[PDB]
C-alpha cells in the first residue's frame, strides 16, 4: 500500500464530478505506457569518431566506458 495516490486537498466533489475529473485526467495521461526495452545500437556512436592520442586516458574513461556501459 506504499504508492503515491491522487489527492483532492480541497473541495468535496460528488460522484459525477469525480468521474468526469478522473476520465479527463486519464485521457490526459499518456506517453510510453509499457515500452519495450530500448534497443542498443552502438553503430556510429560519436565516441568512435574522435581522435584519441595513442596514450590518452580517455581511451579508457570515455571510449571503453561507453562501449561497455550496459
Amino acid at each position: 500500500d506504499h504508492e503515491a495516490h491522487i489527492k483532492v486537498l480541497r473541495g468535496e466533489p460528488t460522484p459525477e464530478e469525480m468521474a468526469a475529473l478522473m476520465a479527463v485526467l486519464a485521457s490526459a495521461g499518456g506517453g510510453p505506457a509499457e515500452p519495450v526495452k530500448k534497443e542498443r545500437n552502438m553503430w556510429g556512436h560519436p565516441v568512435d569518431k574522435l581522435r584519441y592520442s595513442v596514450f590518452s586516458w580517455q581511451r579508457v574513461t570515455l571510449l571503453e566506458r561507453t562501449h561497455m556501459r550496459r
Binding site: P15, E16, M18, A19, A20, M22, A23, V24, S27, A28
Partner: peptide
C-alpha cells in the same frame, strides 16, 4: 467530430462519461 464513451465506477456507483473523441491533454 466523434465522441468517446467510457464507464467509471466511483465508489462502486456506475457512471457513463462522454468525452470528445479528439481530447488532447
Amino acid at each position: 467530430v466523434p465522441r468517446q464513451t467510457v464507464v467509471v465506477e466511483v465508489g462502486g456507483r456506475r457512471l457513463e462519461v462522454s468525452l470528445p473523441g479528439d481530447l488532447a491533454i
